[PDB]
Amino acid sequence: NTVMDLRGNIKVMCRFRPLNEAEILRGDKFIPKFKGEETVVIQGKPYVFDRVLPPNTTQEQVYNACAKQIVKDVLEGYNGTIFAYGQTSSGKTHTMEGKLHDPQLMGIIPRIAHDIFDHIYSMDENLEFAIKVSYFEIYLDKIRDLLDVSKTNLAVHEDKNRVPYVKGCTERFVSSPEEVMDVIDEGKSNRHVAEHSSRSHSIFLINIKQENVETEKKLSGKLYLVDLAGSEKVKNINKSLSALGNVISALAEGTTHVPYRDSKMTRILQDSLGGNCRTTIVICCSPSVFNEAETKSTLMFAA
Ligand SMILES: Nc1ncnc2c1ncn2[C@@H]1O[C@H](COP(=O)(O)OP(=O)(O)O)[C@@H](O)[C@H]1O
Ligand SMILES: [Mg+2]
């Protein structure tokens, strides 16, 4: 959807982060200019987005602009993806997970958590839910499961009925917002070390299933939260982000065939990416000169 027009439904948003302690000491010039709620400029000719989020924008502000709508109709049987993009340091991980237990500094995923268990708990009623989550990285084109260090190079089969999935990826049923937090921690705790996260894609899946206890009828929704690896140029390739780009721009033209198979990632996410779905990309940029290099690359990744 009652708040989603058209097969996609790709929105691109642009969070600029504040200059940090280093950058201010150094005396970094500050390059971006903000015309309105959607436009940003550097040197010349604009970039237009669904939304621009200047340094001042709070997490709670970011959540409402990017996630809250997606959350509502996952609870109504639809699939959704939220991407965080940008060079290393831009604030992708600030945006997606934040400080998990500060009520003010926590990012999207914890906020999605609290949100979910609040629609659910203002009602049931006759609705009984099963919420399971999967947490896995894609490093060097292999699918490492962050919930089970046994599993690396996991395999992408295509289901029964046409569309891809990830065989035998650990699932972990949760039932409180903090149990959702736990799974993020568990994975951070299984996650390889030696920057490593700076060079691998994090996929966080929240699978909500619900059944009516009388009518018996049931809905299923999937919400993927993805923390993409830095887009900079200066642990390899990252043709991946190009496959991603290829998919998005394709959807947003109204051709007919979409380069899903071009990467493991766009293969997996295919059923939560395009058509009936919502996909919001949060591209994250630094306002410094010292990163204007990538800032502009990052900026035109979208269209
Ligand atoms: N919008 C913001 N407001 C305040 N601090 C931020 C913001 N964005 C990033 N930071 C801080 O700057 C650093 C870089 O963020 P990070 O999420 O690690 O970027 P990336 O994930 O792209 O490497 C972190 O210490 C983070 O907490
Ligand atoms: Mg990061």
UniProtKB/Swiss-Prot annotation:
Localization (cell): Cytoplasm, Cytoskeleton
Shown stretch of the complete protein: 340 to 665 of 700
Taxon lineage: Eukaryota, Metazoa, Ecdysozoa, Arthropoda, Hexapoda
Organism per entry: Drosophila melanogaster (Fruit fly)
Function: Minus-end-directed microtubule-based motor protein. Has ATPase activity. Required for normal chromosomal segregation in meiosis in females, and in early mitotic divisions of the embryo.
Name listed for the protein in its UniProt record: Protein claret segregational
Superkingdom of origin organism: Eukaryota
Homology family: Belongs to the TRAFAC class myosin-kinesin ATPase superfamily. Kinesin family. NCD subfamily.
